[PDB]
Amino acid sequence: TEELIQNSIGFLQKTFKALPVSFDSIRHEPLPSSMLHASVLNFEWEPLDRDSLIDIILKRFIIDSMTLEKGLLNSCIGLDFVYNSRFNRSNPASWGNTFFELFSTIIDLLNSPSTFLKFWPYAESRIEWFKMNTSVEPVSLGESNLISYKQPLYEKLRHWNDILAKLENNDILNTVKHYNMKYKLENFLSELLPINEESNFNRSASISASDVIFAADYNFVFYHLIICPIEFAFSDLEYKNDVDRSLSPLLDAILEIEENFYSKIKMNNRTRYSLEEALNTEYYANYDVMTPKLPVYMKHSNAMKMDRNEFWANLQNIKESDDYTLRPTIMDISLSNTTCLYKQLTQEDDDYYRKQFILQLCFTTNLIRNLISSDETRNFYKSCYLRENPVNKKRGLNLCSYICDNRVLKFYKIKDPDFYRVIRKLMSSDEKFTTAKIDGFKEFQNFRISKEKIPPPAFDETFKKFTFIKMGNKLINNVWKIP
């Protein structure tokens, strides 16, 4: 009996073309109300086990319709039907499977990242439906009824990992829509699962992957120190010196430019303050208030206030529109050019490229000191590497204290605290999570959700009445009781 299936498909495709809902009015905000004429929600349709039969019907239907707005819209109505028809189901608790299945297959057809981003807000709005693995009843907000090694996800998770893995390899054939799609997919999966799931938190630390005289050194210290921190910690007293030989002249060559940059502004403020206190009678400059702020004539003029607006609009549409979908990111240093790099670092005006570097140093140099100083950490890492694949201290701590504590902090702490502080706050905030990952994120387990209703409180409005011993105590009052 394939006849029955085909004619059921014609039936559904008939009735679904009558519901008056548009794509925008079905995906983003809503979920379609129970306007379905419930006698269809009772599985007693016109052309006639029962469940899986309905399943293969719906699946066959969706596959046909996708081969645009009619397709996507029709499918979305499909899923919403599946949700709205829980109870009229033999073994209702078994509605989860037939749901997830019908979703994944849709993800498959989707012949672009553009159609994907076009379709995704639908999935964004209905996350609460993906939870409730088999619980027919809605779940309390902030709780996930779902486990990563069992029936619903047991293969879905593997597949959706293969999509990302494939999407990451073609490193050069990615347009900004790709990098903007992998984001939404990942961010999606990081929410179905709780915060400590053996899968969300990266359970095992898995570190990612004359100008020529200048670029040579920069390149050197990059590939030898930053990208591999462990291969610098547990090395000989020579490699640890080989890197040392390259680092220092570079670092000096940058902390020479930074002082010029900061030493221009100091002048262009001190002179102005001196003029102000000179001309006026009784005004005081209140030094040490550097606090950049733009001048008055550019704040008040509206003409100048508009040119910048139209300019940013222009560059915005040029950078955003198509034909320009292979853009380098902002702020990305290009190493292999070796002639622009020197120019990107040795500028006196823009500071934003000499800061990323120092951020990188102050990031790894934290971990090194943490390793050599604390046994528990390097114990943990040793355990990780081995489960993957079955005086020196003094020098390391010296070149660790030389940079993040002797030339950097003693520089920015005096030059500009508004950037001096953020470094210390991040370096602090890192150890928190490091120790948190040494443990199995047990802290994020104690999180409790109070579930109880509360009515408005009581507000007394009544004062306190009096008594009949008017004068106060009885004794004094008896006196006025005399005639």
Binding site: D49, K59, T67, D108, L109, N170, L275, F311, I318, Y324
Partner: protein
Amino acid sequence: QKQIDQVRTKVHYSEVDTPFNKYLDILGKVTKLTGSQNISQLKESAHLRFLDLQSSIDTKKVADENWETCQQETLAKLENLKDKLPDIKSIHSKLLLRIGKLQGLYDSVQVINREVEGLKGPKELESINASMKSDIENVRQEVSSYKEKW
């Protein structure tokens, strides 16, 4: 070390692929029973599991196709990059002149500040002189009043 890769190749080819397996089950069961009315029931599960499996393959035939084309378009897009340079160079030119103009402004302000210092009060010397001329009339008036009343 033979053991390590010996298991690594094992994990490298793991598969789930449920519906296929589901078909193999109903396939072999008939054989096992064959070596020697409810069978109509099996007939039901015969068709169903046959359709599903089939449908699955269809998607894998479609998806692999689509992806392929998406790598060719973005490939050809990377070729004709002659047309795209002139415009971006125009924008880059404009932004190269704005900095120039602004820089000239920050020069003019500089010379103004450097010349005010060479100096007292443009409208101060206005209200002061006005006050100086406004009252001498009054003094002449009152002195004429005392010369009168005498």
